[PDB]
Amino acid sequence: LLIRKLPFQRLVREIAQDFKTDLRFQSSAVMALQEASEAYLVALFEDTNLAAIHAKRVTIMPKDIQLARRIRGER
Amino acid sequence: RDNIQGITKPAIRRLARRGGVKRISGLIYEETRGVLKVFLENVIRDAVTYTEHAKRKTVTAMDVVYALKRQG
Amino acid sequence: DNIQGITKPAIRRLARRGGVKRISGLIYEETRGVLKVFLENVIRDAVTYTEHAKRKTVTAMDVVYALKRQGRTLYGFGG
Amino acid sequence: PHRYRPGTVALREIRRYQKSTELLIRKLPFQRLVREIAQDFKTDLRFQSSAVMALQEASEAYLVALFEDTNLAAIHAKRVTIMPKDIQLARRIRGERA
Amino acid sequence: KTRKESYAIYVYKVLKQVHPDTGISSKAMSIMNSFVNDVFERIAGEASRLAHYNKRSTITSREIQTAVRLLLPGELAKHAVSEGTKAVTKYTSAK
Amino acid sequence: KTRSSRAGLQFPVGRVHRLLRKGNYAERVGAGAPVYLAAVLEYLTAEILELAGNAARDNKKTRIIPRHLQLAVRNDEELNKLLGRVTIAQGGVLPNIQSVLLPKK
DNA sequence: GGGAGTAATCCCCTTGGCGGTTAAAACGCGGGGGACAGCGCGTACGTGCGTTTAAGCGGTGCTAGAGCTGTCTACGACCAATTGAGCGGCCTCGGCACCGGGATTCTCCA
DNA sequence: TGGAGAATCCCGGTGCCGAGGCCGCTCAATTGGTCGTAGACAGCTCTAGCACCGCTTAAACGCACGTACGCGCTGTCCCCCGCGTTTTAACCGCCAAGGGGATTACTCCC
């Protein structure tokens, strides 16, 4: 795994405390969340790399991020 | 509070190098933190309401895989 | 082949509806190719469902099902 | 002789076909095309008219969305014309082509 | 002629309940009918999935509430939940 | 007498209950479930017909055309989120020309 | 004495063809503005090294809450009567498409 | 720069066809009752989730520094747009053969 486990679990408890208080989690659930998030960011970075190579450049830019999300279908 | 700084710059660099990215600009990090926050908001809402249907107080892995199958 | 009936000004009108100003001369062949691929997939699904339903003529409701299976649902034809 | 600068007719045509709603591809060439494709899978199949109209509506919607994505990819590379590599990029980001 | 079931008179009644001085065409009628059928099918399928996941054999109002909260976004989901619970309370409390 | 008037709704409840039993969604079906589903369908119909009526008034017409439904769903954010993957027959597209395409003289 | 095989048909829609004709695709050519290649520069990014910090591993302690079993009671399946909402056929008149003339409003360039 | 000029909105008249009310049937929603079992609720067990502490050491932070390339400018040439003119097939309207599932009569058998 690339992202450290403990800051990721602090992040998921922080982002889930706004939806229901006094919530608990299973360890398999946060492992699945970390795996899904890493797969999502790997696929996103691959698509923004193709967007950057289309623009005759080797360094990726934030405009590549919005191009990949907009052509992908997200908002 | 402000736990989005735990997704650090070298971890983002490893995630970019896994996808084959050679060079990284300095404004990439604040955008990829935002897209990670948006994705986690969209999954954890479905996980919370799947837990709330079962009258439970623990988010199980089955709720997580159901929430991920909702998005595809 | 009847793919040449999808002519140059039709593709031009389709591009001008999308907000495209200037068009290169090699857009048209790739547009015909992707249209043929899309039509082949949809007609394959439609013929599959009208064969499993055991009639000799395919209808509009069958192709509404066909576009529904690809996540491309269409409103306004009895669906 | 009066002659417009090259681009005014383009925006006029863009506004005119963004206001309208009438179908752009003609009816009978699309009918010939759908018969020619459908005779390859199974033989002696017949068509309702509403199925042909539904196929026309689907084709119009898919090609308009594809041209919008192609236009965004063309503007991203500091260009105004659209090229086939923009189309390949647009289909590869959507995931239609492996 | 055979009998065909539609939602045409009901959406016409709702349209006159909302805007009294507006008509509607046949193509728009077909679009609204297909819209109601598709949303009904989606909510019914999601409620069936919630029924199967918790090992239950009955679809109740709680399953429809959870399917509405899953499928609808934003304030529209909250307003639809409020209208549905008001209708259920009015139906149950009636004589 | 009828259950739609008891619920105080306009959409039918018995028809929804029959469509729920016919679809084999579950072995059993509850009592307030078609009431809830009819209320939700009526409410979604209410906003889509509101926005279609406002578009039809703005276009100086007295009848709803598919173009007004297209313009109604593509300017509201939540309805465009809900109907993102759905296409409307005889609808057209929104007027949108990008900023760099304008003749900057 | 009633159920069943065979044929004509009244439609219902589909496919093929035949003539006119007319909008409309197709071909051609000037030329202008945009795609593409090359170069200069200066700043922002990768690499290296000291250094700090917090993740990870282990270990213990405690308890909320998942998970399973028992009992029963309210609630939904289901059947006969029945009757009012909801389907289909019919008729009409107003809203909207369209033609035509006119005033208004972008666009080019001297 | 303002007039020419071509496109575009606006207003009035025509007409035509489908949106929408009305009548009549009919069949599925509603009432009432019976019966079997699905899950509501309590209670018990005991797993695993959370809190806290301490040590170690790889990971990250911050800064110096070289230099690679992103971006702006300039030049070239070429290829697609605007418009005029020629050919062509979509379209409309009609006509006819015919596949096809339900609608009748005509006739036969246990």
Residue numbers in the entry:
A (entry chain A): 61 to 135
B (entry chain B): 24 to 95
C (entry chain F): 25 to 103
D (entry chain E): 39 to 136
E (entry chain D): 29 to 123
F (entry chain C): 16 to 120
Give the exact sentences the study uses for this entry.
Here, we report cryogenic-electron microscopy (cryo-EM) structures of endogenously purified S. cerevisiae INO80 bound to a hexasome and a nucleosome. We group subunits of the INO80 complex into four modules: Rvb module (Rvb1/Rvb2), Arp8 module (Arp8/Arp4/Actin/Ies4 and Taf14), Ino80 module (Ino80/Ies2) and Arp5 module (Arp5/Ies6).
Class 3 is the predominant INO80-hexasome class. In class 3 of the INO80-hexasome structure, the Arp8 module engages entirely with ~40 bp of unwrapped DNA that now includes additional DNA unwrapped relative to the unbound hexasome. In the most prevalent INO80-hexasome state (class 3), the Arp8 module is bound entirely to the unwrapped DNA, substantially reducing the need to bind flanking DNA. These different binding modes of the Arp8 module could explain why hexasome sliding by INO80 is less dependent on flanking DNA length compared to nucleosome sliding. A site-specific gap at SHL-2 substantially inhibits INO80’s sliding of hexasomes (~2000 fold) while a gap near SHL-6 does not have a major effect. We therefore hypothesize that Ino80ATPase bound at SHL-2 on a hexasome represents the active structure.
